Structure formats: structure tokens, C-alpha cells
Amino acid sequence: ASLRRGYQVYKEVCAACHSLDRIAWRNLVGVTHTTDEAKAFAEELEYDDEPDDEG
């Protein structure tokens, strides 16, 4: 419960300046969040895809 609250502090305060690059969304699952909550966090962001057919 403290871990989950700590994630929220990270996300709302620290993440403005600090990265957490070694942690994937899947890592939160079953530790701090359910599969659905973590998928929701991931799905709100945009990531680079592979190039389209015109490259």
C-alpha cells in the first residue's frame, strides 16, 4: 500500500525531472496495480512505432 502511494508521488512530483527508465509498465502489475490499471497508464502515452510502408 505504501509502494502504490509512492508510485503516485513519483508520478506527480518526481517524474517532472527524474526518469525511471529501468521500470516497465508490466513491472507494476501485481505489485502496486492490476493488469488493467497498468495497461491504462501505458495506453495513455504514445511511443515510437516501426515506420509505415513509405518509411
Partner: protein
């Protein structure tokens, strides 16, 4: 009066004969059980071993029927 001793030669091969080997047949059995138990024990963690063998054992078999809740599984 006895003219000759009374005996036969039993079939043998590589210094084994059937009377001797027959005494060891049960021992091979137990060693086979030991090897079976040991092998199965070594692969008890393999998922297929649980799915196909261990979960089917009556009473005891529910020890190996374990599901991760869908909420707790990233994959």
C-alpha cells in the same frame, strides 16, 4: 553303489545364470521405482509434468492446479 556324481550345467552367459539373475529381478524393480520417483521429482517444476501427470493424481493432484488471477498477470 554310485558310479558318477549327478549334475547338470545350467545355461550361462557372461557369468550370469538364471538362478542368480532371478534373485536380483526384484532389486531392479525397486531401483526402477527409485529412478522413476527421482526423475519425476526432478521435473516436478516443469509445467507439462504438472498438467499431464501430477495434477491427475487423486486427492493430492489439486496441489498442482494453481491459477494466477488475471488481474495479477502482465502476460
Amino acid at each position: 553303489y554310485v558310479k558318477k556324481p549327478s549334475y547338470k550345467i545350467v545355461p550361462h552367459f557372461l557369468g550370469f545364470n538364471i538362478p542368480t539373475v532371478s534373485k536380483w529381478i526384484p532389486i531392479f524393480g525397486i531401483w526402477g521405482a527409485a529412478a522413476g520417483i527421482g526423475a519425476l521429482f526432478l521435473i516436478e517444476g516443469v509445467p507439462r509434468t504438472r498438467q499431464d501427470i501430477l495434477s491427475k493424481i487423486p486427492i493430492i493432484g489439486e496441489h498442482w492446479i494453481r491459477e494466477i488471477p488475471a488481474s495479477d498477470n502482465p502476460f
